[PDB]
A paper describes a structure:
Central to the replication cycle of influenza viruses is the viral RNA-dependent RNA polymerase which transcribes and replicates the viral RNA genome. The influenza virus RNA-dependent RNA polymerase is a heterotrimeric multifunctional machine composed of polymerase basic 1 ([name]), polymerase basic 2 ([name]) and polymerase acidic (PA) subunits, that catalyzes both primer-independent replication (vRNA to complementary RNA (cRNA) and cRNA to vRNA synthesis) and primer-dependent transcription (vRNA to mRNA synthesis) in the nucleus of infected cells. [name] houses the polymerase active site, whereas [name] and PA contain, respectively, cap-binding and endonuclease domains required for transcription initiation by cap-snatching. These structures have revealed that the polymerase is a highly flexible macromolecule that can assume a variety of distinct conformations, enabling the polymerase to perform both transcription and replication that require different initiation and termination mechanisms.
On the PA linker (site 2), that links the N-terminal PA endonuclease domain and the PA C-terminal domain and wraps around [name], we observe three nanobodies; Nb8202 and Nb8210 bind identically at residues 220–240 and [name] binds at residues 250–265.
Residue numbers in the entry:
A (entry chain A): 1 to 716
B (entry chain B): 1 to 185, 207 to 756
C (entry chain F): 1 to 24, 32 to 51, 58 to 96, 111 to 120
D (entry chain C): 1 to 249
The structure:
Amino acid sequence: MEDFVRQCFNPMIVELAEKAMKEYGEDLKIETNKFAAICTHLEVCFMYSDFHFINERGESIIVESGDPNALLKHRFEIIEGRDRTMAWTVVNSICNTTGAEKPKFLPDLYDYKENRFIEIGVTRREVHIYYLEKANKIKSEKTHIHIFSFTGEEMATKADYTLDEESRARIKTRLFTIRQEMASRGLWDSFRQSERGEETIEERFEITGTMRRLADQSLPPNFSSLENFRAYVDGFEPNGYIEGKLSQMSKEVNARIEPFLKTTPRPLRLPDGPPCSQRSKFLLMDALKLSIEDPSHEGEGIPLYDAIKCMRTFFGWKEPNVVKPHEKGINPNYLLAWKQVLAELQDIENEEKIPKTKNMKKTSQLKWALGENMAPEKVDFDDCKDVSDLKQYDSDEPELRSLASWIQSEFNKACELTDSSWIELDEIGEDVAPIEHIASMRRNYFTAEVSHCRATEYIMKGVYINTALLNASCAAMDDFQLIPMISKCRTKEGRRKTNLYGFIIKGRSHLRNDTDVVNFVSMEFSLTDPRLEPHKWEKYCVLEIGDMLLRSAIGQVSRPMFLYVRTNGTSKIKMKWGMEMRRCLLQSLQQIESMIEAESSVKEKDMTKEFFENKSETWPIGESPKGVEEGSIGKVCRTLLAKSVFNSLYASPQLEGFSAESRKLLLIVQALRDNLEPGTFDLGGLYEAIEECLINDPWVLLNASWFNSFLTHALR
Amino acid sequence: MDVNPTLLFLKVPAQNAISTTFPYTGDPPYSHGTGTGYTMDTVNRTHQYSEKGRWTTNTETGAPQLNPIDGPLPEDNEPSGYAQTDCVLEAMAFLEESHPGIFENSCLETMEVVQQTRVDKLTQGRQTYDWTLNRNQPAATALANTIEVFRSNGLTANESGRLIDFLKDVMESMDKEEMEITTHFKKKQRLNKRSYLIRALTLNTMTKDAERGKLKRRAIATPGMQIRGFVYFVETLARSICEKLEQSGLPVGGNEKKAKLANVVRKMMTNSQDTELSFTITGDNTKWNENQNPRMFLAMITYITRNQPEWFRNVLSIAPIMFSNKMARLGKGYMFESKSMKLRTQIPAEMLASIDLKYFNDSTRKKIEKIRPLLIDGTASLSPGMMMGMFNMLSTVLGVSILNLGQKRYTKTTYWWDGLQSSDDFALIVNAPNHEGIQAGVDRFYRTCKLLGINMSKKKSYINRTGTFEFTSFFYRYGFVANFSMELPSFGVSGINESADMSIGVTVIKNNMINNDLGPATAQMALQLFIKDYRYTYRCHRGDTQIQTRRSFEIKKLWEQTRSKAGLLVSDGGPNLYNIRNLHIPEVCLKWELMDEDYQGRLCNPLNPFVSHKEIESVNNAVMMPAHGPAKNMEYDAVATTHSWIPKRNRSILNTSQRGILEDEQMYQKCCNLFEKFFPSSSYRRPVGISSMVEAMVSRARIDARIDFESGRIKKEEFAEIMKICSTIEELRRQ
Amino acid sequence: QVQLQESGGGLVQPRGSLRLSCAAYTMGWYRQAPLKERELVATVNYADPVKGRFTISRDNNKNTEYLQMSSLQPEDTAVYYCYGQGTQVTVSS
Amino acid sequence: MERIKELRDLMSQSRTREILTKTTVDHMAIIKKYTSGRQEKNPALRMKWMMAMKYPITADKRIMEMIPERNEQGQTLWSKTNDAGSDRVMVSPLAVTWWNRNGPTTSAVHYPKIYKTYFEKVERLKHGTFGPVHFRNQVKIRRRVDINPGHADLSAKEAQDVIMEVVFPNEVGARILTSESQLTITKEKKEELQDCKISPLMVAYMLERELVRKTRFLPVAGGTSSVYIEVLHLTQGTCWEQMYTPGGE
RNA sequence: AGUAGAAACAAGGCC
RNA sequence: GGCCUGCU
């Protein structure tokens, strides 16, 4: 039958009908009479629509061939011959522009004169039944319907026929051409009734070929095919198989509970080796401040001018000389770098306006100090294979180092009060609710407690230094840059003040990965002699740069004044995390506020004021040789803030591992102290897990010592 | 006196101050170089936990595979992957018996979803291993490349737009003699059957960074695109199953987890009378993923899909069949340094099979020596067990089956147990009349776990009396206690854009106040610090200050120009009006009545060249990877302002041989923008159909010109011009 | 008497030999190295570090297991137990 | 006119012609998401790192013809170098602030009508009345509650057709909404937003947010009302309760 | 040298 | 010496 559509109809219509065939997903080889019937429907749609044009009037202009002009409007514009999505697109667009009613089924054409749709259907059966059939299929329709049938008859409601009658003679001539051409073909044994509305399909997902063999190799050891295994599974029913293997399984497979008593836990062993060194990016306990007493705010001002003005406030400069060498570098380079920094600072002082940011010369001194041109050149393996020295990067456990007493004192003095306010908080919306007033009062109390704390000063120092370093690295990637360490505080009298700890020289910072390292050299003034705790300054070079006179009742001290100079490095991640050190304030004060709220849930009243003023209640916050010492809530605030600050400063994988594996043991010990009969399956394994995190970090070793002390004081 | 914060625990219980034990204020550990060492170590460890299995050689991939299932029962407490098929089938049968109709229903909804799912659902995924280029690429890019290759090779069933048809094409590709791929350096290369099989069965290994809570780094894996559809269907089934199990806690959030934990502890302890003792085990499973054999997941799913259409069973079984034969790419490689000659070199991992061992240290030398027998075409066969939690939900199903297997109806003894399982972590409440009963119950639970290939970490687990325990960093002490140290890293600028960062910060403060019991004063301090960091990050200072920045001049002139300066946004250098009462209001709407009409109009102008919206999914959704958890998405309330710009892209593609991808990106985006202008609903609802672009665009041009004349700007001259231009593009597409 | 009583330990130069006895089913000799765990040495089967160096034996009439240690090394420096008090073995120069 | 003209210009060049011809409508989404840009793992780090560069943001090409290349002192506002995989050009953040002080102005009176949810929140809070804070232990119990206070009793899909018919009336397709509540919602949001020119996508997104019901599990103590849950952070705490009555009541 | 820690940075590539 | 890139 398909030979007929090969022969007669034009290409355009046959591929339109083929795409309509693909539309609903049925195959053309099984039933083709539908293809012919709907392609004839589509053909009558065209032949009825084309050759029919309109101009600004009604009364369509009919031309056998559209002449070249702007007057190519089509009388009837076709609906079908398009995908369902576009057919409904045209339906909705016509409804929204023509203000007509939206039909629920697919029309075939639209006309302007009568401003409505045409649903053309030419069926094998006579018209006077198919018409009202499709009419009762369509609900309350104003779209006019018109149908032909092979006998040659026409019909329509309203007795309406919308265009010329010679066109309809055309239609029925086409119709009988179709008819008495099948006459030569002979199809009416099924042509009248060949489609009955079949819609059914079964989804087929068959495993075959290579993928089947893979299925045959992904079974238990004693199975040969997926078919057999699935049959076995379907036939499988529970018949007490877990019990049999449990009985047969060796009894050494057990989870015996070892009781956890007061005498069970042993102190954590600390590693032994050379004392632990300093790792901070700046001096914390041994910092010195040169000040100007200016009225500018933290960010307000220009760095270089402030630094120069602060440094001019000090008199007593001496020619620098080596006091304590780096022990691994070239100290003369550090000396020359310091003198170069001074010289270029003067050079800025001379000229017209202090630059906002200064670049330094790339001398051999800072070329060595900043580690320039030291990365091995990257080459290909095929060119370097016979080199005996060629091997992997050194990948082994870090060097072992024992704890020293300097970190303990540094933390002790990091929780001490100061003679300045190191936090100038921002603005918030004016409090409107009583709860907001309570929150503001609490916040004011904590700010009064923690602002005068060395932890806040360290927070500001780190934030400013890391912000400046990151910005300089991102801006001046190539050229070495000078950045004075600046921090602005407010005195007890209320006068604002600036403080200059020293200088940082940032080097080449072409940082691609988050782990890539930018090297800088840090110089900081101090008065602490490095000849008393040399092991804490393994990586520092310390010079003697001047003498300071601070008013004291013992005449006047006239102390020496040294310069701690070192080469340090950071990374994008480290800079970003060090510039978010202000969340240590959060951590600490959230803990304290949780304490206050928990206690106030007992007594139905806010308990902040008496906690902060009466200072009757105290918490164990340290141990003295006499015994455990307790301090007021403010001291707890400062201690927790210092702990968070040191966590942010000495952060490392060792800290995370020890924190987790020691929190586990802390929970076990707490369960013991709560009389909850705690038990363990392998306590030695937990101890070994904790002890492997303690390698060389001073902070984690101090935490381990604190944990041992807590165990000793606990378990009683 | 020496200060010691830990001594604070002598007065404050450990859980009431547990936040102090979370050093989440410093930089988390990161990996620096290759992850090849970790990948090799994981492969060797997975293969040696199942050493007593039986060896075979796949006839298709030619790789050695180790099957430990039904192997000898363990005789020691060391990790073992010798799961027994009959035991696990019985466990699943008991799970079904205790929850009748679970499998049949879940299979019904899964069948509905599979037969109505679309291909585009695969684009909604993070990095995936594209085999066309042998590298990780965004899910959409890899899917597009694979579809292009399939269409070039003759597999065009995916044009039906159905994921099931895409999987049919994927499987049909397995039986092809020779496929063709494209490489740029374009060159057409031919892949034989075995090479393509291994490229479709392989995984890409990387090192996990920003992982807090352990000293050593780990390795993670990413699968290809051929196997992700089957994984999607299997995980859909597993999620539908677990949603019907109250003992599971994987498909829920954190608060639901806490609620279920409280309910189970109350149920276990309350029902226990005075005679019965109760004990809670806070258990962690050692080597959870390395001991879960994909064959056992195949067994579980084929038991689940019993009495179901065979096509459903086949499509759900394809995934574990491929995992059982999965291969893993070793990784980036190894970098060597020579200090004598002062140079460095980078050898790819694919050379580990043949490269001499003189360059490697003792540990790496032994690892390579042990893993070499499993090396096939630069990748190692990893049949014995899963790599990194790809089947999280099925593992949770197995754990829930174990938990339910002790409902006192199967124990047949006075002791019994229950609890909650979330993959790699569990809380087990066991009750028994005497300590001997508790010991026997825990021993039998451990033994049954060892029969299913699941191991309990004795070093990271402990048992106490009920009332105090831990679960996924949630510490329960007669009621869950807030931590607030897990969410600390999320208190900074997110890094999306100005308006997005502001809204996300305020919303995070609000949420942590609601859930994590953040205090009022602490919340105010957090708001102040966040505002300070926000102003210092975006160079948007109050405007009345003299802080010179790269943006302080325009901000200051805008400040001096504005009359009601209280309406200026913090992004434009205005005062901050936020407070505890205003944390749930966008900044634009909070300052709407205070803005000057000129500034208000300039700010919220639709014609601004900065705002760009791509799809309904990416309107106000921000992907923030939370600390100590999987990547998560958040809805943030924000008004589309001129500050909603999107930041610069990487721009490093220009120096790579894969430079033509940018031209293809530009052309695809131009075509997509044209289509959207032709089809405005393209973004909100993704268009569907089987036609091609130009057909729809030209035909809609026809119709829209028509109707927009029937009322609108068009004129006959223009309408006819459009009609004949449509004809022109038609004849152009002809040729 | 007690339940278990190990004896015959002491200080020995590397390469030297020693015989441990214990006064107490299948029995085993275990050792606990300083800082390390209690590990199985032999039973009456030998651990791989032991191999062909130590020889476990038992007198079933006298209720006692014996461990003959030959070609001793500084890794065998540990307290040896049977299954008590234990017996310290120290290998040193 | 224009649209078909850039269509013809695209089809003029062979590569785009092939892309338009061989690519089917269904693959629309795929190729639209086809990109070499990886999703950032650490957005904060790079946002703090990119903002230190010059020209850190991106904007459409049209910015080159509305904003001058430099400001009064000569600080550059935009660059002509396009982004990696787009025709957009990289520009400095000042071009934002500049647009807010001398850029074109419009009538933003209809934004309150569009962003109905946020302005309703503001109005509800502005007329709220606070009360005394009572300090007592709060038994926070976890419950499933609806957060959206303006949901019109419609699901996502249920209101998606309404949203399309309100914004994209022609792409609705087969669906013609039956429920009369949807009829009235369509009428109201059609006549209200008849000429709003913000964007079809944002209008659809905000209509989805407003009409679609959404639910989440939260620890609550009292309240349980939709209006009382949006301020759950302000009314309920660990040991304090703040009586509050939104402006709606 | 320095940062850092089971492998890396201490710029890369292209002419 | 000149120019390109900074998660590809």
